[PDB]
Motif scaffolding. Structure first.
Motif, PDB file in Angstrom:
ATOM      1  N   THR B  66       0.832  -1.215   0.000  1.00 50.91           N
ATOM      2  CA  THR B  66       0.000   0.000   0.000  1.00 50.91           C
ATOM      3  C   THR B  66       0.867   1.266   0.000  1.00 50.91           C
ATOM      4  N   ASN B  67       0.283   2.425  -0.303  1.00 47.93           N
ATOM      5  CA  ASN B  67       0.958   3.717  -0.189  1.00 47.93           C
ATOM      6  C   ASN B  67       1.068   4.109   1.298  1.00 47.93           C
ATOM      7  N   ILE B  68       2.243   4.536   1.776  1.00 49.74           N
ATOM      8  CA  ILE B  68       2.422   4.895   3.198  1.00 49.74           C
ATOM      9  C   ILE B  68       1.509   6.057   3.644  1.00 49.74           C
ATOM     10  N   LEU B  69       1.071   6.906   2.709  1.00 46.94           N
ATOM     11  CA  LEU B  69       0.138   8.008   2.961  1.00 46.94           C
ATOM     12  C   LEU B  69      -1.336   7.564   3.083  1.00 46.94           C
ATOM     13  N   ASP B  70      -1.663   6.314   2.732  1.00 48.74           N
ATOM     14  CA  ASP B  70      -3.013   5.741   2.882  1.00 48.74           C
ATOM     15  C   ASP B  70      -3.235   5.041   4.242  1.00 48.74           C
ATOM     16  N   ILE B  71      -2.185   4.859   5.054  1.00 46.25           N
ATOM     17  CA  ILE B  71      -2.307   4.366   6.437  1.00 46.25           C
ATOM     18  C   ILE B  71      -2.997   5.447   7.296  1.00 46.25           C
ATOM     19  N   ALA B  72      -4.098   5.101   7.977  1.00 43.12           N
ATOM     20  CA  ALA B  72      -4.972   6.066   8.673  1.00 43.12           C
ATOM     21  C   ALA B  72      -5.327   5.688  10.130  1.00 43.12           C
ATOM     22  N   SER B  73      -4.719   4.626  10.672  1.00 42.06           N
ATOM     23  CA  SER B  73      -4.846   4.226  12.083  1.00 42.06           C
ATOM     24  C   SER B  73      -3.578   4.628  12.848  1.00 42.06           C
ATOM     25  N   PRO B  74      -3.668   5.350  13.977  1.00 48.22           N
ATOM     26  CA  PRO B  74      -2.516   5.631  14.825  1.00 48.22           C
ATOM     27  C   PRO B  74      -1.793   4.372  15.310  1.00 48.22           C
ATOM     28  N   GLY B  75      -0.534   4.522  15.709  1.00 49.23           N
ATOM     29  CA  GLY B  75       0.280   3.455  16.296  1.00 49.23           C
ATOM     30  C   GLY B  75       1.621   3.261  15.593  1.00 49.23           C
ATOM     31  N   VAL B  76       2.388   2.275  16.066  1.00 52.50           N
ATOM     32  CA  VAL B  76       3.728   1.979  15.542  1.00 52.50           C
ATOM     33  C   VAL B  76       3.740   0.680  14.740  1.00 52.50           C
ATOM     34  N   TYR B  77       4.194   0.780  13.495  1.00 55.21           N
ATOM     35  CA  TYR B  77       4.190  -0.274  12.486  1.00 55.21           C
ATOM     36  C   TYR B  77       5.584  -0.455  11.898  1.00 55.21           C
ATOM     37  N   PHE B  78       5.928  -1.673  11.484  1.00 52.62           N
ATOM     38  CA  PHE B  78       7.019  -1.852  10.532  1.00 52.62           C
ATOM     39  C   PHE B  78       6.465  -1.773   9.102  1.00 52.62           C
ATOM     40  N   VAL B  79       7.000  -0.879   8.273  1.00 53.58           N
ATOM     41  CA  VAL B  79       6.560  -0.654   6.888  1.00 53.58           C
ATOM     42  C   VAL B  79       7.614  -1.178   5.910  1.00 53.58           C
ATOM     43  N   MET B  80       7.210  -1.971   4.914  1.00 52.46           N
ATOM     44  CA  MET B  80       8.102  -2.484   3.858  1.00 52.46           C
ATOM     45  C   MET B  80       7.357  -2.725   2.536  1.00 52.46           C
ATOM     46  N   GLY B  81       8.048  -2.655   1.393  1.00 50.27           N
ATOM     47  CA  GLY B  81       7.441  -2.952   0.084  1.00 50.27           C
ATOM     48  C   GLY B  81       6.290  -2.011  -0.307  1.00 50.27           C
ATOM     49  N   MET B  82       6.308  -0.771   0.188  1.00 48.91           N
ATOM     50  CA  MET B  82       5.240   0.215  -0.011  1.00 48.91           C
ATOM     51  C   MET B  82       5.140   0.623  -1.488  1.00 48.91           C
ATOM     52  N   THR B  83       3.920   0.811  -2.004  1.00 51.81           N
ATOM     53  CA  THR B  83       3.677   1.113  -3.434  1.00 51.81           C
ATOM     54  C   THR B  83       3.978   2.567  -3.811  1.00 51.81           C
ATOM     55  N   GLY B  84       4.137   3.449  -2.822  1.00 55.85           N
ATOM     56  CA  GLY B  84       4.460   4.860  -3.020  1.00 55.85           C
ATOM     57  C   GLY B  84       4.461   5.657  -1.717  1.00 55.85           C
ATOM     58  N   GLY B  85       4.765   6.950  -1.835  1.00 54.82           N
ATOM     59  CA  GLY B  85       4.734   7.920  -0.737  1.00 54.82           C
ATOM     60  C   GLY B  85       5.941   7.897   0.210  1.00 54.82           C
TER      61      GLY B  85
END
Lengths: 60, 92, 91
Positions: B66-85
């Motif tokens: 997914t695009n990192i700018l489309d994440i809309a829930s608060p909290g701490v995540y590990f993000v990888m393989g993002m489609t944009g942003g």
């Protein structure tokens, strides 16, 4: 048989020394009450051990 | 304010039939979709839904695809393989 | 200090530590198949000293980065060589 941690499959980073470090308590638990080293809380480590199984017919 | 899923509602009784505490649980094996919520209700009024953030296997959740700018829930995540942003050169 | 710790299902990690004495922030990361990095401190003026004409003192005053005294028992040429070896400053 062994208590240890790994940074890659089969490479031993630390092995804990039974008697100090840890002991087998009640045949159920690894017990870190000996004065030696232990893994940090919440970390994952490997145990290797022997137990007698009641074998099941049609399964074992 | 979430994705529509099958849920179980647990209703906890109070001193009167006009007031309750409600718990809501989502019915998914997907660790990103399983959620616990609760609120207080009094007549037609209520609090908002209080979302309770779980840690899967006692760890931060992983987000990908997914695009990192489309994440809309608060909290701490590990993000990888993002489609944009993402920032320039940052893969995870 | 206060430690904010994050750890994913693959054992990626982020640790942010703020010192309860100075209020300075320190950050460390771990990969699934690695150890933690050394603690990366927050940015400060002293971290620029390799590129400046001046050193930065503990009170935040400026000074020369090279001071050579007859008590040092060194030549000016050796004091330049020692300064370039210690600091990596070219100018």
């Amino acid at each position: 048989v062994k208590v240890w941690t790994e940074t890659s499959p089969g490479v031993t980073t630390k092995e804990y020394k039974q008697g100090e470090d840890f002991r087998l308590t009640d045949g159920q638990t690894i017990d870190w009450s000996p004065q030696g080293q232990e893994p940090s809380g919440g970390t994952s480590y490997y145990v290797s051990y022997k137990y007698n199984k009641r074998m099941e017919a049609g399964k074992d | 304010d979430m994705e529509s899923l099958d849920v179980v509602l647990h209703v906890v009784p109070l001193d009167t039939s006009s007031k309750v505490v409600q718990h809501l649980y989502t019915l998914s094996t997907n660790n990103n979709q399983i959620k616990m919520l609760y609120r207080f209700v009094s007549g037609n009024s209520s609090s908002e839904w209080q979302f309770i953030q779980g840690l899967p296997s006692n760890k931060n959740a992983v987000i990908s695809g997914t695009n990192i700018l489309d994440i809309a829930s608060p909290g701490v995540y590990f993000v990888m393989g993002m489609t944009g942003g993402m920032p320039s050169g940052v893969s995870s | 200090g206060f430690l904010d710790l994050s750890v994913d299902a693959n054992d990626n990690r982020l640790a942010r530590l703020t010192d309860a004495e100075t209020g300075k922030e320190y950050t460390s990361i771990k990969k699934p198949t690695g150890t933690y990095t050394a603690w990366k401190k927050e940015f400060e003026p002293k971290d620029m000293e390799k590129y400046l004409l001046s050193s930065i003192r503990d009170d935040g005053s400026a000074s020369f980065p090279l001071l050579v005294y007859t008590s040092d028992s060194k030549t000016f040429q050796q004091a330049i060589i020692d300064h370039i070896d210690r600091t990596g400053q070219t100018t």
